[PDB]
Amino acid sequence: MIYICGECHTENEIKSRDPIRCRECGYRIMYKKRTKRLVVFDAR
Amino acid sequence: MNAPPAFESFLLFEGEKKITINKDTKVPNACLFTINKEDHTLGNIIKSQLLKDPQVLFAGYKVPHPLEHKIIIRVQTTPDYSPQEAFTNAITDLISELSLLEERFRVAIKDKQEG
Amino acid sequence: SLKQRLKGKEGRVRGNLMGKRVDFSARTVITPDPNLSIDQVGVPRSIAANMTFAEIVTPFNIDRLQELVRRGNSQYPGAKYIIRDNGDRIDLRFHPKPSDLHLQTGYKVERHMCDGDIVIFNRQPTLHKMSMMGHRVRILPWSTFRLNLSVTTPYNADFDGDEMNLHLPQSLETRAEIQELAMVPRMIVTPQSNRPVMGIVQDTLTAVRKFTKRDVFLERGEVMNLLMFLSTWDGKVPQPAILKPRPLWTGKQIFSLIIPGHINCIRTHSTHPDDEDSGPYKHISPGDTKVVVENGELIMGILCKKSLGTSAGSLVHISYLEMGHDITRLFYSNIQTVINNWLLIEGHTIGIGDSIADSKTYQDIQNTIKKAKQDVIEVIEKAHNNELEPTPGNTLRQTFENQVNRILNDARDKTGSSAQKSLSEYNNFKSMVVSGAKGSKINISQVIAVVGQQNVEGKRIPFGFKHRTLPHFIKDDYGPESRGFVENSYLAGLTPTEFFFHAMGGREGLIDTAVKTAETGYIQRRLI
Amino acid sequence: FIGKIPIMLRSTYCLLNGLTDRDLCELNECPLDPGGYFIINGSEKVLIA
């Protein structure tokens, strides 16, 4: 998938079985990024 | 997780009667009207209007349980009068009173404005 | 080791055999429900959907059970399982199983728990047998067990985060045994003290005291509204006590319709003058005290914890002993319902105005405290000049402490009596104390007049620092303020040293409770 | 090198020491956080006196 970097906030695409290191910053904490499918919230 | 949906308060589920009439055997000329999906708003109005009637010996309403949504109105009338007729007359009188209130409130609005 | 596996609590003998974790049990928080009967309990839909009762398919219930099976586990009034004669459990949760939906006599449908099911209700610790009682299920929205407030006292339960266990009998035989041996109406009177375990409590008790005063007069509409909530009503409106100028019923006249059958009882209200019985107006009782129920009609009196509470000879106890347990259940429920609606009319509250007393009352309290402090000073001077002489069986230190304690307690009592004289009829602290619903005259006095002496280990606040109680006091001060006496009321506010001493007293009480639990539990286990 | 000593947060040897609230926000730390605890295996542990 595409993981947003923790520090430099640049999306990087990491394949499965690949070390979690952002290109150009090297931070080791990535975030999965919001899903394309949309969820309905009742305003209640 | 066990929270009832909000629409349960006033929406009848399929196969539910708004009014069910059961006579009261303990006393002659008495009836018990069970209104579903109604609250004190209608119950107190109807009970007051029934009390205004001179041929209604007894008129009362109760919510059997606050969490559930139901109203029970006991009406007992004199002989030569029917509790169902008393209920219908109460409803018609309240409708007429509310329509008169509407007309006079509209007139009062139009007079408060434009002068 | 093998011994450790079998030895103590959590071992096989006690932790797995004498007691064990069981199926068909549900725990959740409890909240009040005045509208439920004594035996009724309120069960959330989720708890009722998980727990099941196996019902044998018979020719007379095959249609209903087949409908329940058709609904399945998803729709709430449905069945989780179908047990065949062979013992094979068809699962209704997992996949339609259209061929296996058929029912024949001898099959067991594990239906969901429904209204009217008998369940055991439990609170820990089960100190007495009223702590486990049989309740009839009623399914209500939201996620808490809902129980009648008269049933709180046997369980020792308050709705401040308490939880209750629920056990569902799984056989008709054990269901009948529970229903007859343990149903809540059958548990009203305890064999421990031959008194009712349950009585009118909290709002209903205060509102009953207010309702049964002579002053209470109810108009036609209020009477009809209250009669609406009386289940045992015959449908006949009593002739009002005052026919003219306007038809007005009385609170006693309507409460007489609650009292079942023909019950005869004579009690006395808490504020009954001792002089009245000896002197004239024995049967007139100017204060409307005393309580006389003849032919099931409340002829005269104001009801309180002495009449409608858990005590021997109460109206509740006499109703159980005379009319039976079912009619007594109806009695409790009707009292609660109609008196709670009248309380909706009259209302009840507590405010700051209840804590406030007259200016003269405050002045008298201050004068009493001044005189007491002066007398303690005089006693201390007598001891210092060696005039004091030891009381037999006591040292000079002990006799001095006893004299000072007597002076301080007498002043505290006098200030409390002045505060209680100040109380009006409208005062709500007094209303709750008189009804017996909550509080005591001690609490009223501490609120209004004087918190009183703070004592630790049965003595005044000890000389924790070197020969003094706090660093603020001079060494060798045995006066009231130094050793713990709190002259300010809670409403007035404790001064800092009084605050610390009060904290010491409260800490001692808390420690006593916490230490008590374990020793009493061990004793109870040994006895059983 | 003989070992590693856990560092109490916002102590003199913590990296957060002597940092203004803006700098603490840049590091995703709360300005209002008291410190006084150790992060061991990712969990905050407080030595109780």
Place this chain on the structure above:
Amino acid sequence: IWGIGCNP
């Protein structure tokens, strides 16, 4: 918290 004869 009341007195010596009462409660703490």
Place this chain on the structure above:
Amino acid sequence: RDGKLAKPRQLHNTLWGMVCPAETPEGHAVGLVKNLALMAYISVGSQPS
């Protein structure tokens, strides 16, 4: 906590100003776990030389 003696748990007079009188856990630890007062400080230690 197992000890049922009501001596070690009681609020001592010397706790004034240095341990909160109100704040204590309730249960097996009444009066055994305490909390510093607001202005209380605890000595860090010094050389007596």
Place this chain on the structure above:
Amino acid sequence: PYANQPTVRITELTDENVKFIIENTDLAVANSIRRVFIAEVPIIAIDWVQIDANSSVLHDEFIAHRLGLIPLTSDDIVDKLQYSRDCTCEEFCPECSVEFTLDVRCNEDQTRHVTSRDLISNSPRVIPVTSDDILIVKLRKGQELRLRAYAKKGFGKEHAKWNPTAGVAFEYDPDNALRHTVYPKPEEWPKSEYSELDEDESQAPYDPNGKPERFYYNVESCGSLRPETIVLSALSGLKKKLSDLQTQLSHEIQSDV
């Protein structure tokens, strides 16, 4: 044996408030009219939210809650709009709902206050009572909120978001003459604004034959419906509830016969 003829006198009429007096009416009728003001006057409010992108500090359902609480002009079309349950079309359509859109990004350095003004409606009659503004969220630079919302007709019994009124002040017997409230010390109690008593007299003399009449109302609008039309719609809705009740009652009486 018949209903009394009530009378109305409007003392104050402002865009936010209606102060009126209803005379020769029962307490039950008056209280139920107030109750209908609060709970049974239809209004338009957001009840469907779909958040395409929410990088704000507030989570999605927080934003949805705040959006639902935002009042929406429902003066005329709330009577025309149908309930979603009544509408034949699946989900929502122009007849059963109104569509709002929010597309805000804080490109600038300064904090962007997302307001109700940023909500854009597909139909001009419903607007978020903008004609300051209700603040939905504050966006730091690089934070974006995008969402689509659907506003449906409903009344306050469902949810407080559909309350058309802020505070309904209802008072009867301004000077205690029916003794419906018994003061322990009458003098300590402040006089009502509608009180006609002299300053010396704390309470009016007890009227034994009196009945509660001459009810005083102050209805404050939330801005969605004009305060006059709140009262008119409440009266009409209560009358419609009574008429539906009468229809069902007549049907069941015929069935029993």
Place this chain on the structure above:
Amino acid sequence: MIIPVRCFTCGKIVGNKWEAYLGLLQAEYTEGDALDALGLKRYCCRRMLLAHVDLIEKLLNYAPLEK
């Protein structure tokens, strides 16, 4: 965290009044006078603005996850 839309007790919109309240406080107005100027009359509504703690400003200091 952010000023609630609608006072809890009655439902009058208080969400539009926070920035005006802060501005009036900056002007010179006392808290009570600012609350009166904004039109808040019942103490239920005045509690909403008077007791409000605006944490959204502190949370906006942290940098966004995606820029």
Place this chain on the structure above:
Amino acid sequence: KRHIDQLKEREYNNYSWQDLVASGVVEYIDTLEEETVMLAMTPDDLQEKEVAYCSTYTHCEIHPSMILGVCASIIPFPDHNQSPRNTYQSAMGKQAMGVYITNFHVRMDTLAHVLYYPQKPLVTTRSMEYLRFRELPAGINSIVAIASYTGYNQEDSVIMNRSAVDRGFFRSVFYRSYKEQESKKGFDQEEVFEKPTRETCQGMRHAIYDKLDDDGLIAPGVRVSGDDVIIGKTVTLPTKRDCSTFLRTSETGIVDQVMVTLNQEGYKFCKIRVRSVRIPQIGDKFASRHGQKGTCGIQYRQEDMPFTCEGITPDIIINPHAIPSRMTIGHLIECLQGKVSANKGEIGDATPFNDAVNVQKISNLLSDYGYHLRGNEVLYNGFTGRKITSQIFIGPTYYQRLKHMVDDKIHSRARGPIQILNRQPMEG
């Protein structure tokens, strides 16, 4: 006055507490020295010449209220409550829901509760300023009536206004974080995050695995109902075994944040945080700042709650029977002071030993704003509209939402899982 004036200009005057200590104005005294020191609680009351109790005071308390700790310092008017009630309030204030930290978004902590709209108390102690209670408050001010309304506040329960709850009153967010680490123990046996396949992976469940993304981790913003598969982890079997993590039963949340990192070992490590928005129900536990708590007995809408002449309906109704036995008069004084503060626009001062704030002064202040001295108000019955005969004590009191909620406690068992050794139903 010189020291106080310099400290008042503290910043840009470079005068601090250490300068006050160096001047010899203040001194640190321990318990042993407290045994040998004559103290005065207050300078004016005690040092000044009167009937001479002591004329050898060697020290003076800075302020008596400092004898309390952090949790007891939030209690307003603690000197007017019974002592065990202040202990109860300390314990319960450790359990109130609020914004625990400002960096809560960054932190992935299991079991985090954060309140929607925290408010600072209208009646506040001065020492709260040093506890940062204004900065990160926990609880909301609420119009509270001390009344017996419908019997659902009896014992210790509390009636609540459903309309207020619907407007955001005491709404909270519960974040639950799940951690899973893929690891290799055997040389041929490894754990991989992947979407489990029905055929390829021997172990499976009825639970939906569709929500799992390609990596085996649910993306943020996906609703996850109880027992759905948050993380998909499969172990090679020397075909595959399913070690996928599932939601805790009845969690029913939405994924907030999914972070994928490498732990110290270098193995892949995943943390997934789930939001559940919890609205107050009729089992949830709310407590005041005075040591008296209670579950929500029932929720009535604004039409049903009793209303004043002004149209105000209490957010919370508490039973009057709580007050007398517990003697928490600080609750009543706080309601009165909160009414005064809300009408005045100030923030009330409830420092323990002020001696300048009597109840009579608060009553006289409340009288000026058009209310009854003692805070009572004529309430009209919501259901019938008739005036309630007994005037009812109403005021703004600060209430806290404790972490104990009914949804977390409700449980039921029917022929579920069973232990291996005892073959008896499991625990928990």
Place this chain on the structure above:
Amino acid sequence: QANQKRITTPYMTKYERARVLGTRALQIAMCAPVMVELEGETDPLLIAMKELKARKIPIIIRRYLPDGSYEDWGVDELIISD
């Protein structure tokens, strides 16, 4: 024992009533013939209660004396506690 020399109480105890009602209920739920004419009662426990009132439950209680002897008391012979 015999009809003579029956020393146990003639009244049926609460425990005997509970177990008799439950046993009869279970039998009725197991398609056992019902002695009384049920008046539209489809609940086995209610039918068992109805039979107990009519004294038509076909069960005899064997009460074991502490010395080891037993006495056979018919349900009809016993006086119903309620």
Place this chain on the structure above:
RNA sequence: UCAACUUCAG
């Protein structure tokens, strides 16, 4: 998975 620990609830 199981043992241990601590923290809470009443």
